[PDB]
Each structure stands twice: as C-alpha cells, then as structure tokens.
Ligand binder design. Sequence first.
Ligand SMILES: Nc1ncnc2c1ncn2[C@@H]1O[C@H](COP(=O)(O)OP(=O)(O)O)[C@@H](O)[C@H]1O
Ligand SMILES: Nc1ncnc2c1ncn2[C@@H]1O[C@H](COP(=O)(O)OP(=O)(O)O)[C@@H](O)[C@H]1O
Ligand SMILES: Nc1ncnc2c1ncn2[C@@H]1O[C@H](COP(=O)(O)OP(=O)(O)O)[C@@H](O)[C@H]1O
Lengths: 659, 39
Amino acid sequence: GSNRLVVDEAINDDNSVVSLHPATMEKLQLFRGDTILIKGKKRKDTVCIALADETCEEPKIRMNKVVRSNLRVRLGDVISVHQCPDVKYGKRVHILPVDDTVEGVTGNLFDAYLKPYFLEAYRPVRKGDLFLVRGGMRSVEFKVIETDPAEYCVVAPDTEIFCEGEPVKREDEERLDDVGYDDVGGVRKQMAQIRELVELPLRHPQLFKSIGVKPPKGILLYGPPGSGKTLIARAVANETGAFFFCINGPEIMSKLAGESESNLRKAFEEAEKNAPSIIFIDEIDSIAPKREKTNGEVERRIVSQLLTLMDGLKSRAHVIVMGATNRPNSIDPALRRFGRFDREIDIGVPDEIGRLEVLRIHTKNMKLAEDVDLERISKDTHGYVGADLAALCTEAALQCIREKMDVIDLEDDSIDAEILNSMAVTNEHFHTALGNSNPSALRETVVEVPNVSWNDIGGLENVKRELQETVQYSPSKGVLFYGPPGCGKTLLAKAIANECQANFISVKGPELLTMWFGSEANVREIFDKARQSAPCVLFFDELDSIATQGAADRVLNQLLTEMDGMNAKKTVFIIGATNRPDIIDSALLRPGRLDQLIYIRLNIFKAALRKSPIAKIGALAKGADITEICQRACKYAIRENIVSEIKAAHFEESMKYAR
Amino acid sequence: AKGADITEICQRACKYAIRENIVSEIKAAHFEESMKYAR
Ligand SMILES: Nc1ncnc2c1ncn2[C@@H]1O[C@H](COP(=O)(O)OP(=O)(O)O)[C@@H](O)[C@H]1O
Ligand SMILES: Nc1ncnc2c1ncn2[C@@H]1O[C@H](COP(=O)(O)OP(=O)(O)O)[C@@H](O)[C@H]1O
Ligand SMILES: Nc1ncnc2c1ncn2[C@@H]1O[C@H](COP(=O)(O)OP(=O)(O)O)[C@@H](O)[C@H]1O
C-alpha cells in the first residue's frame, strides 16, 4: 500500500519520463534524473527516469501509453517500482523497425527517425521492448533487439547503433498507434463518467459474479454526426482491454431478414462468448427510426429482435452495449428504459480549450514551425467538430505536399525518405486551407466555458452575495437583467461563470422561434441540454419577443412551464435580458419563474486591449458605443504607405456624427 | 409590520451569512441593510 502505485495518465507523452509525487519520492530516496526499474505484470519490466511533479496523486504514478504497453499493464493496475542504481551506459544497441509500421516509408530510420529520438536524449533500454517514433506524417514503431551491458543499457551520444537489417515482426504487441484516451480531446469531463461506470464491469469482472447489484449494461452515446462517438468507445475498449465489435446500422438494413436476424443474434452471441464485451451499435438512427408507424415489416422486426435480445440477454453476463445516434430523439423510446440504455452521454462541440487538445493530438506526426500558433487557431474554430478539426489537418498537410514538389521527380514506389520528415508545415498551409473553411455544427446548442476577464466591466458594485457555494443547511433561483442597451446586459452573465467555473448557454428570442417547434422542441432540447451540465447558467437575451406584434403567443407558455421544477435542481440558474420591461408578460416575474430584478456611478473605468499597436481619457465622459469608437480609432489606421498608431486628432473626427 | 416577500427577506437574512472564515448566525444589523432597496 506504500510502494504499490496506481498507474495514471501522462501529462507529457514521453516514453522515458514518468512523473510522481515528491513527498512519496521523499519516502523512497529519489530525486530527479535517477532511473527506476518498474515491473508490472507477467514478469515483464522496463526502466525509466523519474521527475518531481506535484500534480499527480500520492498513491498514483504517471505512465504513458507506450510505457503502459511494455509492462503488459493497463490503466487502473498496481505496479511496483524498484531503485535501479546498478546501471551503466552502453556500447552497441541494435534497433530494427517493426513490420506493421514500415509501410512504403524508406531511406534511413536512423538519420531521420532514430537520431532525433536519441539526440542528446539519455534513455534506458530493455533486451525485448518496442517503442514509437512520431515523425514525417506518420509513426514507425521500432524494436530493441539487443543490449550490450546486460539488459539495462542507457543510450548516449557515445553509442553505436547498427540499424541495418530487416523489418522485425511483432508478437501480441498491440499497435502503439491504436486509439487511446490521449487521442480523444475536447471531452475530458465527458470521459470522466464513462470511465467511472465501465471501469468495474470490464477491468474487475469478479464481484459482478457474486453481487446482487445490477451493473451498468446499456450505454447510449449521442452528439454530433460529425465527430465524437466512435473514438469514445474505441479509445475505451482498445485501451481498457475489451473485445470490440461495432455493428454498423447500414449493413444490417442491406439484407432480406437474413443477416438482419442473424448478425443481430450472432454478434450478440459472439460478444457474449468473450468475457469483456463492448458492442457499438453504429448508426442506430438507421436501425431504430423512433416510433415509426409508417414503415416496412423489417424495421418492425429488426428493432423487435433487439429489445428482446438485450433484456433477456445482457444480464450480468459481462456485456456492455453502446448505442450511437446523431440525436437522442430519433430512436424508439423503448430503447432507453431499465437495463437497456438507462445511461446516456453527451458529446458536445469542443470548447476553445477542448479544440486545442484535439488539434495537438492530430498535429503530432507533423513537423511544424514556430510561427504556427495553434492557440490562435483554437479560438476561431467554433462550429468545428473533431472531424472538421481533422479535415483541415489533412488539407493543411496535403497543401505542404504540392507546394514543395519541385526537384523531386520520378517518384519511386517507396520514394519517401528523410524528405518526409522535417517537412515544415507553414501557417499559410493552415490559412490557405482554412481559406476554404467549411464548418458543420452551426445550429447546435453549444456547451463551453467563458474565457473573459472580470477586469473589463466597470460596474456599480455588484453585490458579491448573489452567489453561493452549494453549502447550506430554498435559495432564490430567478434573476433578470434589464435597463438600457449596451450597458452590459449581454456580457454581464459571461464574466460571472468565469469565477463560478460553470458552462453557459446563450439563447436568443428568435432562436426559440425555430421552425422545429413541433413538447420536446428545441426549446426543451435547450432546457435538457443544460440539465446534464451541472452547474449550468442559461442566459436568454432578446426576451422582448414576449408580446404580440399560429404559435405566435405560444413558445412563451412553452417557456413558462419548463422554468418551474428547476427549483428542486438547486444547482441550476436562469437569467434573462431585456430593454423594454413593459410588453413582457409579467408571468415570468411570478415566484419560482423569476425572483430578482437587476438594472443595467457615472462613467466607470473600462479596460481596453490590443496594447501592441496602441499609442498613448476620462474627461471625455462629459457601453453605448464603447467598442464603436474603439474600432473606428483602429480603422483610422493611417495608410501612408508611400510608426503612427493611435492619436487624438483622429478622435475629434469621429464624434462629429456619432449618436 | 408597519406573503409579499416573506421568504425573500428570510433567505436574504440567511444569505447574510458572515463569512469570517479567517458562532454568529442571525442578527438585526443585517436586516436594516436589506430593506434599503426592497419593494
Ligand atoms: N473528441 C475527439 N477527440 C479527438 N479526435 C476526434 C474526436 N472526435 C473525432 N475525432 C477524430 O475525427 C475522426 C472522425 O470522427 P468519428 O469519431 O469517426 O465520428 P463519429 O464517431 O461521430 O461518427 C476520427 O478519426 C477521430 O480521429
Ligand atoms: N464595461 C463594459 N460594459 C459593457 N460593454 C462593454 C464594456 N467593455 C466593453 N464593452 C463592449 O460593449 C459591448 C456591449 O455588449 P453588446 O454585445 O453590445 O450587447 P448589448 O448592447 O445588447 O448589451 C460588448 O460587446 C463589449 O465588447
Ligand atoms: N402565512 C403565509 N402566507 C403566504 N405565504 C407564506 C406564508 N408563510 C410563508 N410563506 C411563503 O410565501 C410564499 C408565497 O407563495 P408563492 O409560492 O410565492 O406563490 P404566490 O406568490 O403566487 O402566492 C410561499 O412559497 C411560502 O414559502
């Protein structure tokens, strides 16, 4: 319980660095730079360099995906660490590449791939190990085949590497490029629960033989058709170590009740014959078409053979079924009940923070440039799902191919070489490919996190007591923000969640006037979209559409009933905005619907930005058009092309016509 | 006396929970600060 560490995820995806807690390293006589022997299971062991990282837990150790596969261990297992002082540098180490990775790529694995790996990098060696080198639009696994000083060699600039030879084979070594948790970004929190409910029925299939508890059995994934579904299940079963069969919807419908009734039974029989079963019902929208009263006799039996095959079967037999649909409202209601799909999982469009991680993952095999600032691209990529974030990663890597052809001609079948690596991908390959931009998820209810500073407010002493830490031993839950326009009513609730650390949903009046108003309308889709997100603030601007001048005066009443009931939720709040508080029906003001009213001294301080092309105030006070005078001041950019930034003589020309 | 907002003044009195983290429960000097803006 003191040396027994639990393997965890790696902050840095390095095959040699494993991070640990320093107070635990203070117990086991270790500091940075020293090497440690780590043996996990099946008598296998490797050896790596430690580091003092206080981020990890005390009884937990950080291990990388390739470090995990070398010990024949997987995440959630206990490993033992031993001090390794008896180690010395090595003379010769023979490195052969792996068969399943040298696909057409040729040249010299040492000059292109292996040199940058070990250049000034001091790394330990095993006699029988495998490892991955990400470079040149791909990744070629290598194998250590010999070790000169016993089995614990250490590479250094003083080392002779005879990489000459044949592509060695692999032996029960799962592809180190297979899907993993380090390959799924933008849904870290979404992976928390899915990894808290499949962690036991798959990794610990012991208690579930002798416990009367009914374990989770029916998982229902949903989200965007663009991305975020197949990998959520692929990165789990391929990483947790579970048998993975993914039944595709379109194939089943391609029969005449032949492989429609068989593959449904057979794959349900096949997955159960193995102990860890993960069944991915891809395109369940095509199989289950909600309550389709007008259809053919095959959909009335392909869904009729599915429910009976999961309530009778899939009962403590260590089988976790996983559905996948574009919308959780186009499949039969009898799918989500008890035992079958009682679990549901939201896959939302990645926020600005989540877009950056997935950008990193896919942009790893490439060699980029320092002018490339993927952070700036990670901001202006709303409406972009993991597919489109990978779709431009192709058009960004492929634009570098034609733009740098030139001398290379008469391409051989295996012409790739060191030219493939070091292929610097300029930022223009992004911009020109992003010039033909094409997003997908634009009409969606976006879940994200506000990244705006509270300094740019200049308010009127907003009482801090309009907040709570969910620690009490009833509280008001309805507030509205009215007053003049521009004073801050739109950006007001944005900076509140900056300190509260909660998701937000910006909704407008005519947004609820969606043609898809025919109870679980978008109105209720938006309500329940923020129900899973806990806590979540529902901001509503343009609420002036409450009055008159079909379902004209409807949707309001529709909005009314849904507001109540949320008072028991406690961890959810509703805020609105308006400018003409007269034509609004006073219904919302009623207790429960809303329970507070906030207006909007003198002109307050306001924090600007863009302080680089700036040039050096409160007297002008003698917001409304705060940004309007700012952008026009930047628009007054002197074009004396044939130094100057901002100036005063340009302000006086702006207030001549403003209002 | 010299309902309308019966619970409103009650929860705000509990919301006036002194956070002197670095005993006190309900008090009068916190009521007078509540009726300054009520309606
Ligand atoms: N959340 C994510 N994180 C990282 N990559 C993703 C994510 N979602 C999608 N991708 C990438 O997009 C590609 C296609 O998306 P996919 O998962 O097939 O869509 P879906 O599962 O919704 O049909 C995948 O190959 C994957 O690499
Ligand atoms: N302290 C501030 N208060 C209000 N608005 C500000 C402030 N500082 C900058 N602004 C700018 O003024 C604009 C006012 O919000 P806006 O989007 O115009 O919505 P509305 O006019 O409906 O309130 C913001 O977009 C913001 O860029
Ligand atoms: N004697 C009382 N008479 C009325 N309301 C009371 C009384 N004691 C406490 N209250 C509180 O005042 C609130 C008044 O009811 P409310 O839910 O506001 O509906 P409405 O305002 O439409 O009558 C109740 O929710 C209750 O918590």
